[PDB]
Amino acid sequence: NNRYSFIGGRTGQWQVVKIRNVLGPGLQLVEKVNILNGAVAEIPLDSAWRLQGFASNIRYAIRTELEALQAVQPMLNRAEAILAVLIPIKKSAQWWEMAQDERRDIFERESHHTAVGLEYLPGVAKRLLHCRDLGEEFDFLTWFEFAPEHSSAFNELLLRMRASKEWEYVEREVEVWLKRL
């Protein structure tokens, strides 16, 4: 199954280190994040929030870009990658009104998202989930995993992305730093 849930509450595989409400309404601080694949009948109500999103096909990356990405992309679930960051993202209506060529021009031709991200592989593992189509308050759920030696590089990557043209359209963003249990 391609559906994933992120439950903010008192159980989970990850301990919340901090939450940084970068832009827009934030997320209440909780003790742990519970990650679930597929639907489960019971998710605690004593939980604070529940995000979700699905893995999907490629939307912008071209073939040569994939080849370069799959050649340095690390796997999730590395013993050393005891730190994780969940960054839900929402883009503005203005971004979604645009055609495919206009969004590709902004995503890569101007902002070089993928060329910038490749500099931080294989130290940082990154997965993408889509959730605009589910009516979720966010449009994406980005997931990052890496060893603590890469914390400075990752914090540098965040600031690079936020200074790009593509992030002029982001109107809601939160950082949920996690430590593995």
Decide if residue 147 touches ligand HEM (CB under 6 A): no
Name which of ligand HEM, a copy of itself, none residue 96 binds, using a CB cut-off of 5 to 8 Å depending on partner kind: a copy of itself
Q: Which is nearer to ligand HEM, 39 or 71 (CB)?
A: 71
Pairing of strands 83-91, 140-146: antiparallel
120 known member of a binding site: no
With binding defined as CB under 6 A, does residue 114 bind ligand HEM? yes
Confirm or deny that 60 is annotated as ligand binding: yes
- Applying the rule CB under 6 A, the residues between 64 and 83 that interact with ligand HEM are 69
Structure tokens at 64: 């040569």
Binding-site ranges for ligand HEM (CB under 6 A): 58-61, 69, 87, 89, 100, 113-114, 117-118, 120-121, 124, 126, 128, 140, 142, 157-158, 161
